[PDB]
């Protein structure tokens, strides 16, 4: 209901964890669980590649369609860009429904 593709078998959850690295243990054995660890974290790169199939528009409509367009007029910023502080923003929601089809 929030929109998109209902899947019986969706893309799987991908789970990641830093492996615990104990700190120095005591010199005599204790059966108590280790509470003492070397503080650490991890970083890397992730890539996602998705192939999408397209359904082409077959229309015989004579007159021009409504299209999504950026405003041609001047402004202080460009839509869907960073500002002078480096903050990327999205000016508005963009749906998918522009082209038309007979009912």
């Amino acid at each position: 209901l929030m929109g998109g593709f209902g899947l019986k078998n969706p893309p799987p959850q991908i789970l990641i964890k830093n492996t615990p690295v104990p700190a120095n243990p005591p010199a005599e054995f204790s059966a108590t669980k280790f509470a003492s660890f070397i503080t650490q974290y991890s970083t890397g790169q992730v890539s996602v590649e998705i192939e999408w199939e397209l359904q082409k528009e077959n229309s015989k409509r004579w007159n021009p369609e409504v299209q999504y367009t950026s405003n041609y007029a001047k402004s202080a910023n460009v839509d869907f860009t960073v500002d002078n502080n480096g903050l990327y923003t999205e000016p508005r929601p963009i749906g998918t429904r522009y082209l038309t089809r007979p009912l």
């Binding site: 409509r61 004579w62 007159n63 021009p64 369609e65 299209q67």
Partner: protein
């Protein structure tokens, strides 16, 4: 060659987009009068009171001619939209012309 009762061509107005090619086809119905009562005529700016810049000399002909040289003769407005929103350029490649279903 066809008889009196057979059509010599079919109506084709279409636009086909394939790869880097688009093929436009347009069919129109035309009417041709007799011009100049079948005569060639010398025509001129003489006795028109024309300025020097507007003078001319030439001939009018009994003939008519076909002119398809404009873009809306070929692209529909929607087709023109598809062209200009999606493409950095375009050029004409080849041409096919047909006259048919003549009635005098």
């Amino acid at each position: 060659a066809d008889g009196v009762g057979n059509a010599s061509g079919n109506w084709h107005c279409d636009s086909t987009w394939l790869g880097d090619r688009v093929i436009t086809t347009s069919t129109r119905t035309w009417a041709l009068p007799t011009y100049n009562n079948h005569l060639y005529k010398q025509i001129s700016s003489a006795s028109t009171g024309a300025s020097n810049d507007n003078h001319y000399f030439g001939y009018s002909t009994p003939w008519g001619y076909f002119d398809f040289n404009r873009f809306h003769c070929h692209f529909s407005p929607r087709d023109w939209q598809r062209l200009i929103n999606n493409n950095w350029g375009f050029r004409p490649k080849r041409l096919n012309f047909k006259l048919f279903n003549i009635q005098v």
